[PDB]
Design a binder for this molecule. Sequence first.
Ligand code: ADP
Ligand code: ADP
Ligand code: MG
Ligand code: MG
Lengths: 330, 334
Amino acid sequence: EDSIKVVCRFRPLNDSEEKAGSKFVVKFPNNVEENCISIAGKVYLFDKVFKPNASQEKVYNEAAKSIVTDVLAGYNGTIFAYGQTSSGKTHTMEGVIGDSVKQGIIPRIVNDIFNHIYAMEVNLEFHIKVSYYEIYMDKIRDLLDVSKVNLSVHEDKNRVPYVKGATERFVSSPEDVFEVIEEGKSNRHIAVTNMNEHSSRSHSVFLINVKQENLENQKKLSGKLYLVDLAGSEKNINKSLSALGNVISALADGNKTHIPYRDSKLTRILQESLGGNARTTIVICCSPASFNESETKSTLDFGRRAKTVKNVVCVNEELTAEEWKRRYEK
Amino acid sequence: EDSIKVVCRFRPLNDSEEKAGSKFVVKFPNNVEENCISIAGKVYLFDKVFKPNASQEKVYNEAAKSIVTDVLAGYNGTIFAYGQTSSGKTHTMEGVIGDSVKQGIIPRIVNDIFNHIYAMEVNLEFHIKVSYYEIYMDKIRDLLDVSKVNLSVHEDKNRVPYVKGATERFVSSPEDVFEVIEEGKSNRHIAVTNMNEHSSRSHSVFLINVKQENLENQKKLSGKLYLVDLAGSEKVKNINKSLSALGNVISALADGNKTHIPYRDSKLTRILQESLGGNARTTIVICCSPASFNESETKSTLDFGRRAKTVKNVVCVNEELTAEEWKRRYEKEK
Ligand SMILES: Nc1ncnc2c1ncn2[C@@H]1O[C@H](COP(=O)(O)OP(=O)(O)O)[C@@H](O)[C@H]1O
Ligand SMILES: Nc1ncnc2c1ncn2[C@@H]1O[C@H](COP(=O)(O)OP(=O)(O)O)[C@@H](O)[C@H]1O
Ligand SMILES: [Mg+2]
Ligand SMILES: [Mg+2]
């Protein structure tokens, strides 16, 4: 009963763009609900629309709303950034780590997780593991350990697609996690000639597995929290992105059956995120430039279609076979 | 619709019975179906009736065999011998272990089982544990290690009951079990003044817990085998608190009142809880002297038989589904 949240961010018109004679051609009819864009005769409504002067913090407050609360209550949650190259996926997911104002969703998330744990009463033992890898040309390289290239996907005991053989690092403070991110960022350069080119055509996948045990209940909860910065969505295209569209499309109205998750590694990893058991926000990012009109329009279409999709979401309680049997009676 | 199976065994007229001037007071009308006795001159019917010269083997095949393939199919099954002292319980359940012809139900079941395990076409990992203990005045003693008299009875996740902290010896071959049996047999002779009296007044129970994993698809199944030699059914007050509980449980199950069943009123009846009305396939073997002098005792053994055969057991395969599988089995309800 849980619509995928879709949130739309326009960046400021930049230089290449004024000086190549691109006009700013986007409007924001309002509202009051502040959730609407007009481009060249089309009109779109989402959960929020952010204007070029919207700050990382403001954006974080909407996009990452309950997610850390949710993940700490044992819900899976995901955020990913979708749109063409240079529209601001990385600015948004990452921004400038270390800069208070200019940092993006991931780092805020990270501080915000630990602050919540501290301020938490009830004595709970947190195991927190993190992974960081990329999908490029439908192949997975672990950024934490570059000998693990071309990794494979497999389903688990619950039949949830996970990436097998990937480094999972324990962490106990923000500084820990940031050290891991900085590790991954240089590893990504290994064998890479043009990083602008490489990262615009690959998916960066950041994963925070959050296990909690209550040291009285004996109650174990769990939450997978995925932060993803996609390959650029431009044209045709980049094939995991057709897969993403095809999965989105197949989820319309109804419909939980015959869904082409396997069409790509990406879409397998994101399986719960789209239709399954997670709360999912998507940030679509857009240029406001006239030159980018059709690319913007499709990003918005994609957005349009994805808004309508509803997830099947519950607490990930960790039970033994015995308990689950009993928990069944009426 | 697994009704408990009742089987009736008469043994030959014995030496002391003759000298004391007792006649054979029992006929076997044929049948054909081989299923009835008439005792001066009231008739009783059972699943099967064995004349004084039935061989061990015949008794085994015609009353036990099917239990071996059941437990291998993951069902619980139990066999017990009931009837007055001297009537042939121990001869039936045990016989003479060494002796290929004179051995009884226990060793043959054990042979049968390993053999079937040997020749299984599909590949399985089979773990077998046996337990071996004695009930005596509602007090459980472990024959595998005498450091434990007085063992508790506990429930479990499903329901059991089962006996806490009894020796469970892992076994791999018949000789493995035969040794364990010889272990409990000499370990019984001690803490005990006369054996015959003690024997006659106690229940001996043998459990074979039979666990299996299908290596190919990891499908898991379990089975318990209770092989019980009861105390003599005679008040000869002088009757047994466990036998009486047995009579009452069966009595309860023979009318319509469930609502309530006296299981708790004895340890014995708690162990045999699934065997009686619960989730196991149960065969009872009533043993009888054919001597005129025993006519009364014989008849109550018969009547107990006649009441037990009408009990219905409520059985299903003991599948051990994993956690994940149960989780969804519960989307059924909610
Ligand atoms: N909302 C924004 N405000 C200011 N500058 C931005 C914004 N979004 C993107 N930029 C700038 O645009 C350039 C490209 O953005 P980037 O996030 O790398 O695009 P993408 O990762 O989607 O290809 C970078 O200089 C970035 O800092
Ligand atoms: N079917 C039978 N055929 C021949 N002898 C038997 C048979 N059943 C019992 N006996 C003999 O009669 C005696 C009583 O056997 P037993 O099983 O000890 O009685 P109980 O019911 O007290 O255990 C033993 O000496 C045994 O060898
Ligand atoms: Mg990029
Ligand atoms: Mg005896």
